[PDB]
Amino acid sequence: VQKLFVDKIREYRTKRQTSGGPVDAGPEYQQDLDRELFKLKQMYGKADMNTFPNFTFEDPKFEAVEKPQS
Amino acid sequence: RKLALKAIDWVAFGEIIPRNQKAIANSLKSWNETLSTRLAALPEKPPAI
Amino acid sequence: SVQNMMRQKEQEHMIRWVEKHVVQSISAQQEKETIAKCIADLKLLAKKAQAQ
Amino acid sequence: SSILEERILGADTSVDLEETGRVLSIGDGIARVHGLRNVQAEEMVEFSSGLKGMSLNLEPDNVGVVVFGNDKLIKEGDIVKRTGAIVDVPVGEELLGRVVDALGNAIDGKGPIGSKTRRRVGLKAPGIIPRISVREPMQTGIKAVDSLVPIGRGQRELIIGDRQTGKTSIAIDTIINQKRFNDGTDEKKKLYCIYVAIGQKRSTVAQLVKRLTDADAMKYTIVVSATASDAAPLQYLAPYSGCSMGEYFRDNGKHALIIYDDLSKQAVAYRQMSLLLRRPPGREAYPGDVFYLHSRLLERAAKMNDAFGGGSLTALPVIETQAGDVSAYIPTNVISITDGQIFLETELFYKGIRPAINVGLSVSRVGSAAQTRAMKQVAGTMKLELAQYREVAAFAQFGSDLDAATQQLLSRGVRLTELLKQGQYAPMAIEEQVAVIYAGVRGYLDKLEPSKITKFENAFLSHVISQHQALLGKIRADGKISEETDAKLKEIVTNFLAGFEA
Amino acid sequence: GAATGRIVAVIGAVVDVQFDEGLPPILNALEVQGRETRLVLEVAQHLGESTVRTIAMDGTEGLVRGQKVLDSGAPIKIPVGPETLGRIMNVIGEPIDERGPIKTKQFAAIHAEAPEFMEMSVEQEILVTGIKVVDLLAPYAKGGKIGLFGGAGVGKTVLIMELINNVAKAHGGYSVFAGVGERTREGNDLYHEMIESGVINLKDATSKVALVYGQMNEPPGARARVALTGLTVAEYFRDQEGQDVLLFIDNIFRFTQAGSEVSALLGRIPSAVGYQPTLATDMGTMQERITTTKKGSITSVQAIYVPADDLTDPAPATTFAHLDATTVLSRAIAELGIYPAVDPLDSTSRIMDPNIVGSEHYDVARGVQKILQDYKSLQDIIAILGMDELSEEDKLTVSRARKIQRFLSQPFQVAEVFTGHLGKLVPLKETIKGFQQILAGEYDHLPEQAFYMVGPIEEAVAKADKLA
């Protein structure tokens, strides 16, 4: 069916004329890609784009031992 | 690999014999065991970027 | 993990657009079907020839 | 995108005359097909919608066919085609590190598996000439298994017990523990593994691939998966397909291992599939040849001679039993195919012995006693010292006092019982096993308390891997524990016992 | 009007119907013309030469041969959406609350497939409930299936009325209840206890729970398909709205009991003790859709019945591979008075683990099973011989494991109306602390009548303070 071989490539080239993502999204693709974009961040964490690690650690304080001896 | 060795000091080190200060050494070796291998996995270097 | 998930949501929509549009394009034709029948005869004419 | 367009130009639209049988009925998976003259038995037939099926019964009027999939796209009056091949699955090393369904299509989504050779699921076990006896060991890393109930390479060993006792965990510490040989250097100490999931929900098999990928265990296994949602002819075909990827290894040189989890769910997929073909029921409505179902499976687990390649194929079938009764129909038919067993119980699991192995009953035809040379020294005496314990240590009510006579021997058991306990997903090595077992049988623990031996073990084990690495390398290399190697260990246990609790 | 058919044979609830052209595919719906109510037939088989065999959703009395039958074109569809909350439905999705129609924008078929492999979520947590037997020994998760096995008269629904009273109040998302084959006055006291307590709002759109009902008066083509109905209203609230939904099913055995009543008449040889040949493929197609996935999370709680108090029967004993937690109840426990009569030795989890439940909790867990097994392993000798022929160490796993059995019975909130005792909720951290003081041996002077039917551990010393 090479007449069908040409007819699924030629209506693939029409999909390669794109402006803003989906062609017939409407309220469908706008809600779904925003529902999924939250879920990759919801149970994952709150993370910005480029912020480095900012913290500070304190070690164990070295106490002394009192000892009258001999 | 910044890491220090030591001597074999487990036998009489709990026998420090303070004024009934048995807990002073019996807690001392207890900190000594966990801190040894845990700081060994710190001391050498960080992995590849 | 955001780069990969937006590729997956885009990939399935791109497939169904080519698929749901070809249903009406194959249905509308009326002259090329007569072209399609004579080659369907010639394939069957070719098919029985290699058997016997 | 360039990927969709290159997939559509590589597609081949070949057309030919089929051989074709009209459908007469479709209900509950069985499609009695009018027509189909020259069909074989066990041939794979292909429905119109993309489904696939296998023609089991031949008959003069109709042809019975069972479906690999779902029977709702199939209507009376459909078209059944002929492939021309008895049912075959792809095979190779290229399936390594994947999760696949029961016909070799990937359900992980990493893509198409590039496989080159195809092998039937109904091939024949090799006979009497091309085998040899069992020379090698297979290390599990469990300490109650490796010392007391050893398992050779090429020996069918049955893990049997109830639900939620340890049958899956026992066979997953075994998958993890071969990590140390697979990154080594010799090609004859490796062990490539295979897990077959029959009748399991996908929220257990997608969770076991997680446990097998943090420890990087998944780079040397395959997971053939037929979940509980699948068609009943897909849970029947799964162990015959998983066993046929095992025999790429064994028939080319290497050593494989295969776990059937479990084989009480490959039987109720045969009872249902062959009641709707109108075959008369036997006992408990099982068919006549459930013994022939399991026996033609568990005899491919060979150990070939060295003029064929010398490869091996171990097998570890799991069996779930009801209420711990071992005299049922499907248990006893598979006890008497396997060389040895591992009897997992429940009162061992709850009293505290975990892994809950009944070391009294866990018999094993020892596999030409390929335990290893050093473990024979310390677990030879352990086997007898534990057997001496079990005859005499079941009173729980004492009236008389014989500390010179009896209470010395039963103090050697509780030090060796509480030594045998283990954790989970942390399996040991064999020379780390010889060291910890040395300190138990040589009297070097009778002055402890039994509530401190599990604490004594990890402090001991961390001391020997850190400070004594060149010691343990002479046990693994030389095999045996030599007399000068007996000398060096005599101080280390006593030097550590001098400063253990302080 | 795709097709027209005439009834040919009628056996109970298995109506045969012959078409002339346009055979319906399997599991369509057929509409019987000439009745006062709606009668929908769902195609099951294809018996050869333009003849199907169907299973009917309502009663078949009054049908004659030749009576016309019309083809819908689609399976049983129900109206799904956010307006389904506070409404009661039946197997075909019609309002049986007499408050008028359900007006949604979309419709959902009853029959859909299962999720794939690569849409599973593995993340486990702990859902603290407030029951001591479940928090300590067998902790529930947040997103996993739970079963409550039990006979007849043990407590599988007083236990399910607690996990609503403790979890569905402090929940933030929605909720779905389903009744499959259990009695109808209990399905009326869930309407007049969720209206009074603000969960059903009759006047605006601030209601949380949905309801779906097919009870023990229906024909067995309805009980076999009512469980796939509440399972569909609890998937729109997962995949298309993205919430965290509960799901309470009672009872799920009647999906199977009423599937071996229409399997004899379809022409099938029976398997073991009387069940259908396909017992464990239809169960693995209903249970494989009740999942937590990457798009939402369903926290199932299913009550399961065991026939004639037998756990090796084929209908309960094939449900076990589909769970995460398990709460096997018992009869002989409940003859003593221990309520909730949970078997501490038969109940499991997959999150009881020292890295998940915390290594302090995991050692009070395994250490209290060890003392419980050792009381069971001497019941041969105590029953024949006596208590008085024991040692002194094993009169101290007997007296300590009778203080532990009694300290697993808790007064529930829903059971105040029975006995007149205040329902107690304990937190998690006050049970671990309260069992370490029975294992270490601090309360070995208090009697055993003081550990019984109390909440946190300070009531046990207070009940011991009363009797003197």
Ligand SMILES: Nc1ncnc2c1ncn2[C@@H]1O[C@H](COP(=O)(O)OP(=O)(O)OP(=O)(O)O)[C@@H](O)[C@H]1O
């Ligand atoms: N070595 C061990 N020590 C202590 N507990 C363990 C060990 N191995 C497994 N367990 C625990 O025992 C429980 C059951 O183990 P597992 O799931 O392997 O049993 P199973 O019989 O395979 O279950 P199923 O009956 O569902 O197949 C799990 O909760 C697991 O955490």
Ligand SMILES: Nc1ncnc2c1ncn2[C@@H]1O[C@H](COP(=O)(O)OP(=O)(O)O)[C@@H](O)[C@H]1O
């Ligand atoms: N927690 C409890 N406290 C006291 N009595 C209970 C408790 N749970 C159940 N019961 C008793 O057991 C019976 C259980 O019946 P019910 O739970 O309604 O249905 P099922 O028969 O399915 O268990 C109740 O009527 C009640 O008398």
Ligand SMILES: [Mg+2]
């Ligand atoms: Mg298992």
Ligand SMILES: [Mg+2]
């Ligand atoms: Mg009830």
